[PDB]
Design a protein around this ligand. Structure first.
Ligand SMILES: Cc1cc2nc3c(=O)[nH]c(=O)nc-3n(C[C@H](O)[C@H](O)[C@H](O)COP(=O)(O)O)c2cc1C
Ligand SMILES: Cc1cc2nc3c(=O)[nH]c(=O)nc-3n(C[C@H](O)[C@H](O)[C@H](O)COP(=O)(O)O)c2cc1C
Ligand code: NA
Ligand code: NA
Ligand code: NA
Ligand code: NA
Ligand code: NA
Ligand code: NA
Ligand code: NA
Ligand code: NA
Lengths: 404, 404
């Protein structure tokens, strides 16, 4: 049902904050949210142009795009997710970032690489294997699926790992700049490739990229360092989900605990900040949520206070922040330090004007999980229309098309 | 001035708790507290026998002895601290543990090794150098002092590190058992030898005992493992002070943050517990105190929640727990999980019956920092006497003597 909320107008959520080179006028952020309304060849679509535009209308909002593939080897969904590796991709994204910018808002692109969870049939069509830090699967079913089509997961070679830094992510970053993104965000969360490198359940390498906490972090820090030299540290973010068990990450049951893995990473990031190479923000998933699933208090094994104690810069937190609506006690506590942003993903899907609703205490429209991942405009841009105007059957038939 | 306190009788502080093989009847503990009333040759004294006996009278209290040297190379104070490496040491300690036991209470011995902070003149009299993980000093003054007597700090060789495990600590553990101690506690806090191994500001080794988080922890875990095979894991504790800057530990300013170093260690301890080799307790210093110094809230850089999230066994916490007297809100919160002990060091010096006073809400007698470290009975056992009975000049003259 609809969520009654108290207005946040007079709260820290509407105090300006500098994030890298840009100043936000609200601390409410749209986090990366996969929806599968890109074109078949991963170019952003007409639907996406309106979708991001509709969420940019409170001037000075930060929007972070849905996970966007860095390269063909980075892909692996059956649904149509966007990419940022070709000039065509960048030119289409630029229409979208232009629209957000014309509203005085800002946009970060989340760069994803699927890794061991890439669909093996999809990858086979590209003549590629699913790849990872090590040759592992998230489940027996995943292993059987891959072996059945003769396309097993394999470990990247040392040279391939270098190629991620100097080729795949470098080109994605260059394309992101061509596309006018204000930031690029490394996806190091939720059991995808970079999280697979960081944690021991997924990384048993014996080269410089595994075999210790420091070695497992090496690829991620190499990307931070190299990409900082290309786009500047002020245009870089990173997302982590220390507590998540999404895609079979062991988290607090792994042989190295997330507090160890992620405190190591965050302290290395702060040391870079101390030397003048501080990245724009660290985005962290609160333990209330794991990937796209809520986690009971009983099941929660830690929290993200360590990030606040170790990192001195901007932090973005997300995960069921309306759980204590209408008064938003937890949100208010979490933004009290004046360097913290708060994200809403699921409610932003059904409330394109969410910043305005939270500002003025307007009831939140419930979201529709059934249309989170479908291929058409129904449950996508229809939340911007008066219900009386929406032709459902027409909109279900409205698949993504080229911009303009 | 005296501290008004509310009674803790009906609180979790007077619920029984199993710690290793023994059951305590109070959760109030006397933590290790150096006082320098041992004999010159480090044998425990008549004064110490009464001192520990006087603190054992609430049946089922755990007392932890003052830091006790594991070996001659472990020493380095000018004052007279006790040892546990000879039969003479063990026989004297056994008179003390017998007395505690006859009151139904229990006693752990804290095993210390000074390392880089050992007084270089004292060590020179033994024909030894101050030794450490690496050849470092806590200050320029310490370096100048050592070089001036031609006795610089030096790094232990790999073989010497093995000798700590198989000789120094093994023999101390065997003597501790001969002495009737219920537990041995590894001192891995406050900038002494084991803390010097754990943290990077003090350990730059290039053998298996330094050069990574795992390598720096290796000696400590080797001691836990080897000593568990000698005395049993149920007779082992360890003390850590993640946040302390005592003896120039860099703590949150080091190149690896304490949350990383100490979460690694504690999770490795829990993995041993999961396999049936769980140690009796982890003792942690709360960030209110660093060594023997209080730390302002402003200066506090983290907390010990991580220990509670990672370790499932008994935890002992200490550090200015009367700061929110009379109601003891923080103490009550911290023992609510039913597996946590709370220690008082400074107030136990001036209140030998502290468990009884806390039980029944009797005002605490102020402690006397001026006599914490002096060489005689004044301000030592005199707190057990009616003031009217105490002859001050006689007691100042009363230096430690042999038991019996
Ligand atoms: C439909 C959906 C798609 C998502 N896609 C992404 C994604 O592309 N990248 C990512 O880091 N997290 C993704 N997430 C996780 C969200 O960004 C967010 O952290 C999570 O939903 C919790 O926030 P919320 O309670 O406000 O929804 C997704 C979540 C959902 C429900
Ligand atoms: C005089 C004195 C001697 C101490 N000696 C030791 C010691 O031998 N080993 C140790 O681990 N801590 C030692 N400490 C630290 C205490 O065990 C304790 O953690 C600290 O005093 C904070 O607790 P409190 O506020 O109840 O005094 C000592 C502290 C003082 C004041
Ligand atoms: Na403003
Ligand atoms: Na999948
Ligand atoms: Na899945
Ligand atoms: Na915060
Ligand atoms: Na009892
Ligand atoms: Na000293
Ligand atoms: Na000192
Ligand atoms: Na507790």
């Amino acid at each position: 049902s609809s969520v009654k909320i108290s207005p946040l107008k007079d709260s820290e959520a509407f105090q300006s904050i500098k994030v890298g080179n840009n100043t936000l006028q609200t601390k409410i952020v749209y986090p990366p949210t996969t929806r599968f309304r890109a074109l078949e060849d991963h170019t952003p679509s007409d639907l996406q142009l309106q979708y991001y535009g509709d969420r940019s209308t409170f001037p000075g909002t930060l929007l972070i795009t849905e996970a966007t593939f860095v390269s063909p080897q980075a892909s692996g969904y059956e649904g149509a997710a966007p990419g940022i590796w070709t000039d065509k991709h960048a030119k289409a994204w630029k229409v979208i970032t232009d629209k957000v910018h014309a509203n005085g808002s800002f946009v970060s692109t989340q760069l994803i690489f699927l890794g061991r969870v890439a669909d093996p049939a999809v990858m086979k069509t590209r003549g590629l294997n699913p790849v990872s830090a090590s040759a592992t699967y998230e489940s027996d079913a995943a292993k059987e699926a891959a072996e059945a089509v003769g396309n097993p997961v394999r470990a990247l070679t040392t040279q391939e790992v270098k190629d991620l830094v100097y080729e795949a992510y470098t080109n994605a970053a260059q394309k992101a700049m061509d596309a006018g993104f204000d930031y690029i965000e490394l996806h190091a969360a939720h059991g995808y490739l970079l999280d697979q490198f960081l944690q021991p359940c997924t990384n048993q390498r014996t080269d410089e990229y595994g075999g210790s906490i420091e070695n497992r972090a090496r690829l991620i820090l190499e990307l931070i360092d190299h990409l900082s030299t290309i786009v500047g540290a002020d245009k870089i973010g990173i997302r982590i989900s220390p507590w998540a068990t999404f895609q079979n990450m062991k988290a607090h049951k792994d042989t190295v605990h997330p507090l160890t893995t992620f405190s190591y990473l965050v302290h290395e990031l702060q040391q870079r900040a101390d030397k003048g190479q501080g990245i724009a923000y660290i985005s962290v998933v609160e333990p209330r949520v794991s990937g796209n699933v809520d986690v009971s208090e009983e099941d929660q094994a830690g929290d993200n206070e360590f990030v606040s104690k170790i990192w001195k810069g901007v932090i973005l937190k997300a995960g069921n922040y309306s759980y204590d609506a209408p008064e938003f006690k937890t949100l208010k506590e979490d933004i009290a330090d004046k360097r913290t942003l708060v994200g809403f993903s699921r409610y932003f899907t059904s409330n394109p004007n969410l910043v305005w609703k939270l500002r003025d205490g307007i009831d939140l429209v419930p979201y529709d999980r059934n249309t989170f991942y479908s291929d058409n405009n129904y449950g996508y841009n229809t939340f911007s229309m008066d219900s009386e105007e929406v032709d459902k059957e027409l909109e279900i038939k409205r698949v993504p098309s080229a911009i303009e």
